[PDB]
Amino acid sequence: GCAEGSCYPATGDLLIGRAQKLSVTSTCGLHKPEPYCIVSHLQEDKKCFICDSRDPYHETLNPDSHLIENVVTTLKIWWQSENGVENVTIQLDLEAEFHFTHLIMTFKTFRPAAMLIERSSDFGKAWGVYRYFAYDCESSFPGISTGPMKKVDDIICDSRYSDIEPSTEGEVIFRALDPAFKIEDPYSPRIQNLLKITNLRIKFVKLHTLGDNLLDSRMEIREKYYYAVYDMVVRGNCFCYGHASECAPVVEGMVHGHCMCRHNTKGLNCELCMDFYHDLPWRPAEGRNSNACKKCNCNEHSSSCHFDMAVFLATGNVSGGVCDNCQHNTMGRNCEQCKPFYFQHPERDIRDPNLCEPCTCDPAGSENGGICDGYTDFSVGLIAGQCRCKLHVEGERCDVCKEGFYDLSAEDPYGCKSCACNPLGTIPGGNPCDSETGYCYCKRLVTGQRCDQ
Ligand SMILES: *[C@@H]1O[C@H](CO[C@H]2O[C@@H](C)[C@@H](O)[C@@H](O)[C@@H]2O)[C@@H](O[C@@H]2O[C@H](CO)[C@@H](O[C@@H]3O[C@H](CO)[C@@H](O)[C@H](O[C@H]4O[C@H](CO)[C@@H](O)[C@H](O)[C@@H]4O)[C@@H]3O)[C@H](O)[C@H]2NC(C)=O)[C@H](O)[C@H]1NC(C)=O
Ligand SMILES: *[C@@H]1O[C@H](CO)[C@@H](O)[C@H](O)[C@H]1NC(C)=O
């Protein structure tokens, strides 16, 4: 179970439950009845019938309809192209984004003379070519390679499925991950650009005529050459990087496309980290390792955080979440400090909403605009609150002139100005002057500010 490590949804047939998503290029009997023939082994004999494909097949009402929706299995139904048409294309459209195992088509007539398979990850915008197939990889597909594959993603031209010999029920097969390889790293960029699929597309380009030149011929010669397909399975699954055990609707036997993520992951494919769980870098599960996204810690002064790789490494791959918009005047990568002009109450829990107290330093007399010590830490000379008074100021809040000085003006570096009280004419003992006026207390028979005159 996911509650024990990595986990993945079941595999299945993508076509099931998705019949109405199939679209063709040619289909005998769409508008008005067309006839056809079933040649045998080397043209021994031929029996012909009619193709009335203008109404959904039914065994006892309309037995000659052969629309593409007839490939999705669950008797003998099928799809069939127009007689003598050599350019037919089938297309599957997925609502979500799935992983592709393998495709298995079984024709009723004679497997294509030559065909190729394409796909799209970016919803029918860009198209990649999985592989080519032919009986003459050189005439039909000049340039494309044959022989062996130099890489697990080499586009080549197969031919083991483009014969004739198998009269009917012949099969075409394609596997995303060429069995002839060892998938070293699963989640790698290339092994991924092989399974990623939203749109499958099969293009037929050559019909086996057994000699006859369909080129301007009697409806008697072409009426026997056409692609017909009994059914086809598109094996695959809904990918969730190990973080989900089952996918939900975006029925029966149907492969769903919405990952029911777990492990604090969120996303259509759980490739993201649930909100506020950005303390470790997102990773896919493996073995019993969930690699579950880790909850951020902002000491309860936020709930918006993001993951920063630099920080992650800086801590030795321990943690990399940094908090956003620290509330309560806190600060720090985890909101574990107080912004200037505030200081941590010596008591209070670091999680307390009021952990941070405002300074009380009088800006004019203090040093550093009146920023107090933010927290206590003897070893360095830090006390929660303590203000740094200027040279000639004193008091818990630095709002007082030291004896002998006056005029606490913020406008100056040291705060107060020396009274400059003459030692002679000034009454000795206690404060020699007014802290405001700067007027010294003079002896008798002496006068004037500085008790000099
Ligand atoms: C702390 O974690 C970081 C983050 O990345 C890892 O995070 C963990 C949680 C998992 O998610 C894990 O899968 C992530 O990789 C680590 O930093 C990264 O470490 C990987 C190690 O594989 C680095 O990848 C390598 O990069 C070099 C240089 O670009 C490549 O050469 C390697 O690929 C080939 O190297 C030679 C080629 O001749 C041959 O051995 C093979 O051909 C190799 O395939 C390989 O890709 C990646 O660059 C690192 N990225 C960062 C973040 O700088 C980090 O190591 C870890 N610290 C610790 C605990 O040591
Ligand atoms: C079929 O493909 C040929 C080239 O191979 C092209 O000339 C022709 O126009 C195509 N016919 C279709 C599908 O309209």
Residue numbers in the entry: 29 to 102, 108 to 283, 290 to 492
Cite, word for word, the article reporting this structure.
The laminins constitute a family of heterotrimeric glycoproteins. The short arms consist of one chain each and are composed of a distal laminin N-terminal (LN) domain followed by long tandem repeats of laminin-type epidermal growth factor-like (LE) domains, interrupted by one or two globular domains of unknown function. The LN domains are crucial for laminin polymerisation into a cell-associated two-dimensional network. Here, we report crystal structures of the N-terminal regions of the laminin β1 and γ1 chains, which define the common and unique features of laminin short-arm tips and reveal likely interaction sites for laminin polymerisation.
The crystals diffracted isotropically to 3.1 Å resolution and the structure was determined by molecular replacement and refined to a free R-factor of 0.288. In contrast, the few pathogenic missense mutations are concentrated in the LN domain. The conserved patch is most extensive in the laminin β1 and β2 chains, extending to and including most of the top surface of the LN domain. The level of surface conservation is generally lower in the LE domains, with the exception of a pronounced patch on a protruding ridge in the LEa2 domain of the β chains (third view of Fig. 6B). The most likely candidate, in our opinion, is the β1 chain, which has a highly conserved region at the top of the LN domain in addition to the conserved patch on the β6-β3-β8 sheet.
